[PDB]
Amino acid sequence: SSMILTQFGPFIESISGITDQSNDVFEDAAKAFSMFTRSDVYKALDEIPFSDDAMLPIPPTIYTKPSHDSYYYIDALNRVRRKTYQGPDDVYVPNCSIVELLEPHETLTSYGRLSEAIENRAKDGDSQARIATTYGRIAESQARQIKAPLEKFVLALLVAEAGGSLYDPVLQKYDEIPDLSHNCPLWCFREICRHISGPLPDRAPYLYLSAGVFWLMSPRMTSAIPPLLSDLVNLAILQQTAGLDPSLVKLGVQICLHAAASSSYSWFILKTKSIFPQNTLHSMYESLEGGYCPNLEWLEPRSDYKFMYMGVMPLSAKYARSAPSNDKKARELGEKYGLSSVVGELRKRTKTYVKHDFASVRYIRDAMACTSGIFLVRTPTETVLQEYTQSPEIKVPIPQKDWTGPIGEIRILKDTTSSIARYLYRTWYLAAARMAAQPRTWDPLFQAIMRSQYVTARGGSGAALRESLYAINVSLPDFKGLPVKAATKIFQAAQLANLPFSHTSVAILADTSMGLRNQVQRRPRSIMPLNVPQQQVSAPHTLTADYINYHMNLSPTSGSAVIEKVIPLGVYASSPPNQSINIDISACDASITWDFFLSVIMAAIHEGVASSSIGKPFMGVPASIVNDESVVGVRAARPISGMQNMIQHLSKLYKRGFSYRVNDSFSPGNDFTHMTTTFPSGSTATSTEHTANNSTMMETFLTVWGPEHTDDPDVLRLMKSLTIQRNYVCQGDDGLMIIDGTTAGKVNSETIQNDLELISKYGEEFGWKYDIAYDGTAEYLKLYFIFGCRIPNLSRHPIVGKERANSSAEEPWPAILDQIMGVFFNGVHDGLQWQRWIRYSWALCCAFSRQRTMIGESVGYLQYPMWSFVYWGLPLVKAFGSDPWIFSWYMPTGDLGMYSWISLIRPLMTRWMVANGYVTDRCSTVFGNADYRRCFNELKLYQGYYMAQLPRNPKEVREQFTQALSDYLMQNPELKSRVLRGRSEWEKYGAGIIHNPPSLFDVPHKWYQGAQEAAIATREELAEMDETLMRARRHSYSSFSKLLEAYLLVKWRMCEAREPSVDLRLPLCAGIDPLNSDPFLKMVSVGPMLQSTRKYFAQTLFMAKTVSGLDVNAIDSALLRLRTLGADKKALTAQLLMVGLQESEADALAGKIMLQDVNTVQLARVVNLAVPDTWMSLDFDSMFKHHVKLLPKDGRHLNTDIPPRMGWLRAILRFLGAGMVMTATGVAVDIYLEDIHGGGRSLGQRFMTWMRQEGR
């Protein structure tokens, strides 16, 4: 587009599939991005001839806003607070003016920052100023919840889109996605800003800075503008990259405009966030007339989460939505927030989809992408006062007479009790007893593991611990002079290392420092991190909880990535005839208190643990004596174990309540301690504890309470057919009730409704407010599912958004590159339109690839070559004269991906290099007569390759510290003896074979390092990181990594396309349909991954877990490598002794490893090959097994044979073949090993040389 087209022309065509990509053009584009002034971006927006359809009414009230002053007040405790007007929730940042509170910036005369006078006036205690400073700071924070300046994302979008529609290589046609002249979000962005800038030359409404913000000194500017603008940019990009229906998009813009027009953007979004899902996802198929859905079989044991696809299930009226209607509630919500037209339109459109197919799920997805993606912001004071103020209402308390006399801090719940607690007790008691009876529980290694679990870089309320400890004349070492972040539990461990449990006991009752983390479409999450002594004492609670979750219920241990959220379960649960009820325990932490749960649990554990832990200490805590008034009248001193001693001290804290130290950085004068019964979120027990209570209560309801509260035959039948071991999956406060159907169709809806109401009333009995949703849909762990189809929720993954809870400065460049790559991978997982997405990412990466350096008056520039992004996982569009778009986003990362795209066009590269003067007389085994060495250096391919592999983070008291950490870990003498034995044994049988021996003695240094890396980098350190970068770009190379040079000796032949693994009319992931060719064909050919990835990979390790500080994958690599390198069994035994194992287990596991048939994935680690994250949603196990043939297409070749003792090659070879198959755009294809240059024998030695050389 003239200005844009003129400056990025060549780059635009190279990322559109018209021209080859080249570092020169990439870097010219990078220089262009960095020289583009901010206001020029807005001038570029001016050149776009917007269409009438991209316009909508912009509420004038968005620009004229009231003073912040009437929105705050000072409370009884003199804390600056938010003044409520629209309800209990109306506590976020208010939509007010801001200019009157700023002082012009020195150089940027049209921008201003919060008045320095107002802040000092506030610092000395003025009431009016404290209010203005709070508002100023909180509004700012709200404006900082992004990764970088919006202009970067917009500029990149303009550059990417100037390339016009993209030609799909498989469909053989251009996409019909509307150009920017039809992008309403972008049009709004331009108008809003233009209206605000008016005559001012500066076009930006605010400037995003490393730690703050400056606002354009316009009376038309508002605190609500940054969030609004941020939503608009995301929508603008998604409409072009997810091909979102432009008409649905305009609705989302309306909602945002209304949020800006209101008195509080963040509050408004919070109240209306359900609009799109409720009126689409939750109201689909009121009339089902056809289509297909998956037919999965849930394998046994159900706890393995392994499913098998059996075909499609023809849909008909039989399966039409039967869940309760929500039309009334939905419409009431709209009317209440001035959005009835939007709700009405959405409801009307939803009724038109009468078939369940790609079109309909894509419709839902599109609608759900329009929701605001801002990270809601409010002051910590507000979050603390709202999430820790109310207790649960126990409608049927545990009778006081049902407790015995005390046994120290606890009381036993009599068995004669009639309370529901009886059951919560039996379950925890049982579990405690079995947990404690396990021989492993008493193994020193296991206890070192439990003690290292919380020894991390994260904070542990260090300040309060030192204060509570200081209060008893117990001073802790200061380690004066150590460059480590003291505010880390690692540091805490070092300080406590040589003190008996008795000296730190009081620390168990010390205050807890509140942390914070903002969320999209949700209130802020509070972070209450316990201290080391507290965590230590929490072990019994945590262990018993794990036991329950491992042996007694159906639960998961998911993270935050889609790859680990058991996608298959949702598919199953949402496929008719099956049905699922989404159940949640609202205000879970505030509902697990002493009055009911904790007093019961502490008692059940304290007793269930008694006989097996009898006369032993535990994890450093000694046995003791407690006052026993258990038996009526009698009063003795009963001996208790170390384990019991812990529970005993823990009960005192749980019983007392918690003290949260609130340090509101945004509200001057708001420093206070808050006492509450609300449970800590940063305890090793939190999550697992809640998971166990969740299932225990659900089990009690299905077994006892429910049956006793109804005689309804149907409800009694439903109940009886459910079991917490088969039909209820839960994690923390989230639960999914899976009601399997029958041949007679699905279970009666009315019958389910009665069951749910019973469940609801049941919870009120013990203070739990269940949040039940029965809507024809499944929602578990933040993934949405309808009729067996996953609906990615794009609104939850803001492209420009970023969580910044505190006021610290953003991470220094180039951390942003890691985030931008993180943005790209989200697109791959969420199924955006592959070509539009790849092109956009390239524009985005290019726009951040350059950084300006000032080395004392000397001006320079850091520049990552385009090739670094490839190494990071970004597929090429077109190179070395190839066809465009032949590379898929499933191209592996690092060496495996480099090997894949190179092998795919190897002949091409050779031909191109020669054609361009890069020729030699020496014959390369890979590139023939091409002078590749000189080519890759000139094109910066080597430079980019090695630069990408550099860490993007600047890098006598030391001996004391490390030694302290060592005493902490090696506390138990028996454990140390094991490690020493391993060492002497190692010198005899393993030394020399490998140089990577993992060892507990390494942990102290591993921890120290982590405590160092946690500290904030120094100016010099940052400068050294840059120099390291420039050095790598200036150096000249002659080859890739040793591993990649070895993979390149392997050649393949791609043959017949695989037959479909799953029906082509079957929706598995909305957005991933015949309109998104590459992802759809890969999904169809390769097939979805039908098992929990956590359970799959747990089968690829010899040892599930180890001490925090060592890598289970590394240990598995050391063992397998020793085996490959011909080491003796005793060497593997030595290696296992060095990580804590007892000689007995050591010798056995070793002998087991020596004879085991290691499968592809696990063995592949001997050479650091990992299954790519992007592949986790597909059936990669099958690809490695049945579709990568290692027997040449036409028989056996001398070079392709596998030597007798190198069968481990097959594993490696499988990855290489799979790499190429997955990297090639289109249907997964069958690939056949064709050749190994120097033969399999030579190849093996080559990898063995690499195996034995690691870290010399």
UniProtKB/Swiss-Prot annotation:
Keyword Transmembrane helix: no
Gene Ontology molecular function terms on file: hydrolase activity; nucleotide binding; RNA binding; RNA-directed RNA polymerase activity
Keyword Ribosomal protein attributed: no
Gene source species: Reovirus type 3 (strain Dearing)
EC main group: transferase
Coiled coil: none
Annotated Gene Ontology cellular component terms: viral nucleocapsid
PROSITE patterns registered for this protein in UniProt: RDRP_DSRNA_REO
Catalyzed chemical reaction(s): RNA(n) + a ribonucleoside 5'-triphosphate = RNA(n+1) + diphosphate
Keywords: Capsid protein, Hydrolase, Nucleotide-binding, Nucleotidyltransferase, RNA-directed RNA polymerase, Transferase, Viral RNA replication, Virion
Compartments where found: Virion
Enzyme nomenclature, EC number: 2.7.7.48
Function field: RNA-directed RNA polymerase that is involved in transcription and genome replication. Following infection, it catalyzes the synthesis of fully conservative plus strands. After core assembly, which consists in recruitment of one capped plus-strand for each genomic segments and polymerase complexes, the polymerase switches mode and catalyzes the synthesis of complementary minus-strands.
Listed name of the protein: RNA-directed RNA polymerase lambda-3
Family of the protein in this entry: Belongs to the reoviridae RNA-directed RNA polymerase family.
Matching InterPro entries: DNA/RNA_pol_sf, RdRP_5, RNA-dir_pol_reovirus
Span of domain RdRp catalytic: 554-791
GO biological process, one term: viral genome replication
Pfam families: RdRP_5
